[PDB]
Structures are given as structure tokens and as C-alpha cells.
Motif scaffolding. Structure first.
Motif, mmCIF file in Angstrom:
data_model
loop_
_atom_site.group_PDB
_atom_site.id
_atom_site.type_symbol
_atom_site.label_atom_id
_atom_site.label_comp_id
_atom_site.label_asym_id
_atom_site.label_seq_id
_atom_site.Cartn_x
_atom_site.Cartn_y
_atom_site.Cartn_z
ATOM 1 N N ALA A 112 41.364 -19.867 -1.888
ATOM 2 C CA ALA A 112 41.691 -20.868 -2.900
ATOM 3 C C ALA A 112 40.420 -21.435 -3.520
ATOM 4 O O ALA A 112 40.297 -21.502 -4.741
ATOM 5 C CB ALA A 112 42.541 -21.984 -2.308
ATOM 6 N N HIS A 131 38.429 -19.264 -5.944
ATOM 7 C CA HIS A 131 39.047 -19.206 -7.265
ATOM 8 C C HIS A 131 39.001 -20.522 -8.056
ATOM 9 O O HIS A 131 39.501 -20.598 -9.176
ATOM 10 C CB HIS A 131 40.458 -18.620 -7.162
ATOM 11 C CG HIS A 131 40.476 -17.215 -6.634
ATOM 12 N ND1 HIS A 131 39.839 -16.174 -7.274
ATOM 13 C CD2 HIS A 131 41.027 -16.686 -5.516
ATOM 14 C CE1 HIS A 131 40.002 -15.062 -6.578
ATOM 15 N NE2 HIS A 131 40.722 -15.345 -5.508
ATOM 16 N N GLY A 132 38.359 -21.538 -7.483
ATOM 17 C CA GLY A 132 38.069 -22.780 -8.204
ATOM 18 C C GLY A 132 38.775 -24.020 -7.679
ATOM 19 O O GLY A 132 38.607 -25.113 -8.224
ATOM 20 N N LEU A 133 39.581 -23.852 -6.635
ATOM 21 C CA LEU A 133 40.274 -24.977 -6.028
ATOM 22 C C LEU A 133 39.341 -25.605 -5.014
ATOM 23 O O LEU A 133 39.465 -25.396 -3.797
ATOM 24 C CB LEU A 133 41.592 -24.550 -5.398
ATOM 25 C CG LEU A 133 42.538 -25.722 -5.127
ATOM 26 C CD1 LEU A 133 43.123 -26.263 -6.438
ATOM 27 C CD2 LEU A 133 43.621 -25.307 -4.178
ATOM 28 N N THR A 134 38.376 -26.353 -5.543
ATOM 29 C CA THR A 134 37.305 -26.918 -4.744
ATOM 30 C C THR A 134 37.840 -28.001 -3.808
ATOM 31 O O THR A 134 38.959 -28.503 -3.987
ATOM 32 C CB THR A 134 36.178 -27.476 -5.629
ATOM 33 O OG1 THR A 134 36.697 -28.527 -6.442
ATOM 34 C CG2 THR A 134 35.572 -26.374 -6.535
ATOM 35 N N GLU A 186 36.716 -31.098 -3.394
ATOM 36 C CA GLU A 186 36.853 -32.354 -4.129
ATOM 37 C C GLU A 186 38.174 -32.464 -4.899
ATOM 38 O O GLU A 186 38.809 -33.515 -4.873
ATOM 39 C CB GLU A 186 35.635 -32.626 -5.026
ATOM 40 C CG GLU A 186 34.370 -32.972 -4.214
ATOM 41 C CD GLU A 186 33.412 -33.931 -4.921
ATOM 42 O OE1 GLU A 186 33.827 -35.065 -5.281
ATOM 43 O OE2 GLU A 186 32.220 -33.541 -5.098
ATOM 44 N N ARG A 187 38.594 -31.375 -5.549
ATOM 45 C CA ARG A 187 39.903 -31.336 -6.206
ATOM 46 C C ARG A 187 41.054 -31.568 -5.211
ATOM 47 O O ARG A 187 41.971 -32.357 -5.472
ATOM 48 C CB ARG A 187 40.103 -30.007 -6.957
ATOM 49 C CG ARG A 187 39.276 -29.849 -8.228
ATOM 50 C CD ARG A 187 39.562 -28.489 -8.895
ATOM 51 N NE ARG A 187 39.009 -28.385 -10.244
ATOM 52 C CZ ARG A 187 39.697 -28.563 -11.367
ATOM 53 N NH1 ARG A 187 40.993 -28.875 -11.325
ATOM 54 N NH2 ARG A 187 39.087 -28.434 -12.544
ATOM 55 N N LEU A 192 40.890 -32.928 -2.116
ATOM 56 C CA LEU A 192 40.802 -34.299 -1.592
ATOM 57 C C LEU A 192 41.509 -35.305 -2.518
ATOM 58 O O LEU A 192 42.282 -36.149 -2.051
ATOM 59 C CB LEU A 192 39.343 -34.705 -1.368
ATOM 60 C CG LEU A 192 38.583 -34.040 -0.223
ATOM 61 C CD1 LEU A 192 37.083 -34.408 -0.245
ATOM 62 C CD2 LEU A 192 39.213 -34.396 1.120
ATOM 63 N N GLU A 193 41.246 -35.202 -3.823
ATOM 64 C CA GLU A 193 41.895 -36.055 -4.810
ATOM 65 C C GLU A 193 43.414 -35.830 -4.828
ATOM 66 O O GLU A 193 44.182 -36.789 -4.794
ATOM 67 C CB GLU A 193 41.308 -35.814 -6.201
ATOM 68 C CG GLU A 193 41.686 -36.859 -7.260
ATOM 69 C CD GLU A 193 41.051 -38.237 -7.006
ATOM 70 O OE1 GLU A 193 39.995 -38.312 -6.333
ATOM 71 O OE2 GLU A 193 41.609 -39.249 -7.491
ATOM 72 N N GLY A 198 48.159 -27.550 -4.430
ATOM 73 C CA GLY A 198 47.813 -26.980 -5.731
ATOM 74 C C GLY A 198 47.466 -25.506 -5.736
ATOM 75 O O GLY A 198 46.871 -25.002 -6.708
#
Lengths: 233, 233
Positions: free
Chosen positions: B34, B37-40, B42-43, B45-46, B206
Motif C-alpha cells: 500500500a 503505491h503512495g498510501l503513506t 502520514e495519510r 494516521l490521519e 483507504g
């Protein structure tokens, strides 16, 4: 009553709480301060997509799958659209994302597209690839405040013409002040949006109280337990 | 019926959709892909903070303000608690956040605390600073899977003892497999959580469909239109 005081349109909530509009510049300043304290764009893009998609799922009834045409511009406002589209696709909505081609790549767009690409959503660059018959919902993220010559572009005019001819109701996420939306979604605090924004809602984007205070806004939350709330004139 | 196939406990949704557990190792692999592919982090956690806070607000009755005691460890699971705590504080919940002191700083903790510091929330490092009377909700994020000796630590045993004596019901966000929680919140796909997890819920974090497929999981969304759903044995 008035618990939000800004240093110009005023709205109120279902409970009567006054939420005033702020200027574009104060909104920009607010978000910059939010970013300084760790509320990064990537965090906000993620939260905005979740909260916007929750709103759109409510608009879709929220029990064949419903269909959403997403119209995105090559800017951060369009990236917010792609986030919303990925979260909708994650929840079994048929998502068709329109985004015109361009040459100057944008980090937020690149990141959101990368995740969107791993969904069952469809990314298109031609308006002809969008449904002929009315969809269930159009999501409009075509315009951005920083691109003053964007509204003169043929690609934009065609996209707007497409939305007008489709007949589906339009949700505009974070539209500019100056397509007639059925609903519009403001972020954090509203800009002085007018009658062409239709039914106005406000989205919580994670901003702590003291960030508002740092830009001279005496802020108390108008949200209650909800992350998206209806606002009335 | 079974629309999620993994390569061990099985749960089902209100509608009868089967959601199997996955191993710690597969969950870790899932999230790594994940991330690629850009689902960091920080994202996530938010997003986790938003959806967990939404769940917590429902447990609080979703209408003086309600009071939540947040118990976090010095790790990413603790950072998830702080995120939930900031979002709750933004929605007028009285939040008291316990985090013990430590020396090895962690980016996720630092960033989450930076935002939490700008809320009306209270950060404490002593258990004596927490309420003497029962709060409305205890949120437990004390343990983390990466630390096998964590549960042997006096600070932890004290925190667990505090939770057990307060009388308020406990929500555990993302607990390890091996405090009797009333409810627990699994993320993406559940681990084989047992009876000490109480009523198990699943949170959407997400993750696009094709990320699951890349780790060998044939995945179809069990969520419907909701981002947090109850699971039954």
C-alpha cells in the motif's frame, strides 16, 4: 449565536451557530499555519477524500452500483477530487474520473492517481469516454483559484458544457467564489460562496483550534459530532 | 458469502459477508505494498484518526462535554491514538492523553503531538494526572506488536492497572493478538483477535482493491457505504 469571530457572507448551522466566511487570503494563511504545525497537504488530501466521499455516499442514498463522473483539473483542487474518487471506488461506487492531459506534473496529482490506478475506477482524458446517459452524481473539481486563465481554456469550457448536458446533480468540492452546483463543499471555513454554489456544506479538515487563533480567528467548532455539516444563509 | 479469499479466525458482517483474519506478517506485507503505491503512513494516521474518532463519537452517544482518557505508547500504534485524540478534541470532546516519557523520538509521534498541542487536549505523562472518577471512554493504544518486552515494563503494567480500575469502557484501537476491551478496532483486515478484544470492528484505511491482489488476497469490500463496521464471530 456567534462563536467564530474573524478579523462578507455569513452562514449558520442547523443548531443556529454562526459560521462566517473568510477571504481567500485568510484561508490560504490559515492552511499555511496548519501546514507549519504538521497538517501536511497529503494528510488533508486524505481526510478531504474520506469526508467528501462520505458526503457523496449520503447523496447517493447509501443503502446495480451507482455511477459517479468526477471532473478534475490539473491542480490541487483536482487532486482532492481524485482522493474522493478513490475512496468512493473503494466503497464499490462505479467511478469514472475525467482529467485532461498536461505536461507539467504535480506531486499531489501523481500521488492520488497512483492510488486511484489500483482501484476499479476508470481514468479518462476525453469527455467522450464519460457516460451518455445521466449519471447519479457529478463531482466537480475543475477550477482552481490560482489559475486565472483556466476558465478561458477550451478543455475547461467543454468539461463545463459536458456537466450541463449530462443532467446529473453536481457536487462541487471546494469551488472558487467567482456549472451551477446542486451542492458545494467548503473546507475548514467557507469562502463567501454565492447562489451558484447551491446548497453549501462545510467539511472539517483537521485544523486544531489554536491554528485559527494564530491567524486572528476566534474559533469554536460548529461541527458537533459531524465532519460535514449543512450551512444556510 | 465469501468474497475475501486469503492464501485462523473468520468474522462476518451484519449482512453475512465473510471477513477472514490475516497473519501479522501478511498485514505488514499488505501495508508495505500500500505504502509503495503512495498510501503513506502520514495519510493512514490521519484517516485512522478520523474514522476512529467517528466511531468513538458514536460510542459517546453522538448528540457538559464527554471526557476521554487516551492511553498511548511510544510507537506508531500510540501515534494512531494521538491522531484519534486530536480529531476528538477538534469536536469538543474533553481529551486527556497519556503518553509516558521516552528518549528515542519517533516521527509519527512527534508530528501527531505537534497537532495535538494546538488543540484544547491535555497531554500528560503521569497516570495520576488522569481523572479519579470514571471517564466516558478509555481509548487504549498502549501496546505494539514490534516490542515483545513492552508488557513486562512497569510503566505499561501501571497503565493497564489504571484502565482496569477507572470503570469506563475501553476501546482498543489496533491491539496485538496475544485490558479486557469492550470494543476493538481492526484496520484494513483483522488479525485473529480473540475474546479479550470484545466486540470487533473493522476500519477502512483507504487501501485500493488491487493492493490486496498484489499480496495474494482476492478482496471485495465488506464495508458497503460505511468506513467502520461491526464484525461477528
Amino acid at each position: 449565536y456567534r462563536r467564530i469571530i474573524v478579523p462578507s457572507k455569513e452562514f449558520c448551522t442547523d443548531s443556529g451557530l454562526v459560521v462566517p466566511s473568510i477571504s481567500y487570503e485568510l484561508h490560504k494563511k490559515l492552511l499555511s499555519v496548519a501546514e507549519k504545525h504538521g497538517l501536511t497537504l497529503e494528510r488533508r488530501l486524505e481526510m478531504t477524500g474520506v469526508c467528501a466521499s462520505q458526503m457523496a455516499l449520503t447523496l447517493l442514498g447509501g443503502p446495480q452500483r451507482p455511477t459517479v463522473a468526477l471532473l478534475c483539473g490539473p491542480h490541487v483542487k483536482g487532486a482532492q477530487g481524485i482522493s474522493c474518487g478513490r475512496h468512493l471506488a473503494n466503497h464499490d461506487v462505479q467511478v469514472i474520473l475525467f482529467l485532461p492531459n498536461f505536461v507539467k506534473m504535480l506531486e499531489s496529482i501523481t500521488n492520488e492517481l497512483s492510488l486511484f490506478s489500483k482501484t476499479q475506477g476508470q481514468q479518462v482524458s476525453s469527455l467522450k469516454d464519460l457516460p451518455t446517459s445521466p449519471v447519479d452524481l457529478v463531482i466537480n473539481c475543475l477550477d482552481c483559484p490560482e489559475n486565472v486563465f483556466l476558465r478561458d481554456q477550451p478543455w475547461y469550457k467543454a468539461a463545463v458544457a459536458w456537466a450541463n448536458q449530462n443532467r446529473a446533480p453536481v457536487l462541487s468540492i471546494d469551488p472558487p467564489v467567482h456549472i451551477d452546483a446542486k451542492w458545494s463543499l467548503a473546507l475548514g471555513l467557507p469562502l463567501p460562496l454565492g447562489e451558484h454554489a447551491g446548497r453549501i456544506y462545510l467539511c472539517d479538515i483537521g485544523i486544531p483550534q489554536q491554528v485559527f487563533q494564530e491567524v486572528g480567528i476566534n474559533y469554536h467548532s460548529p461541527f458537533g459530532c459531524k465532519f460535514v455539516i449543512p450551512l444556510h444563509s
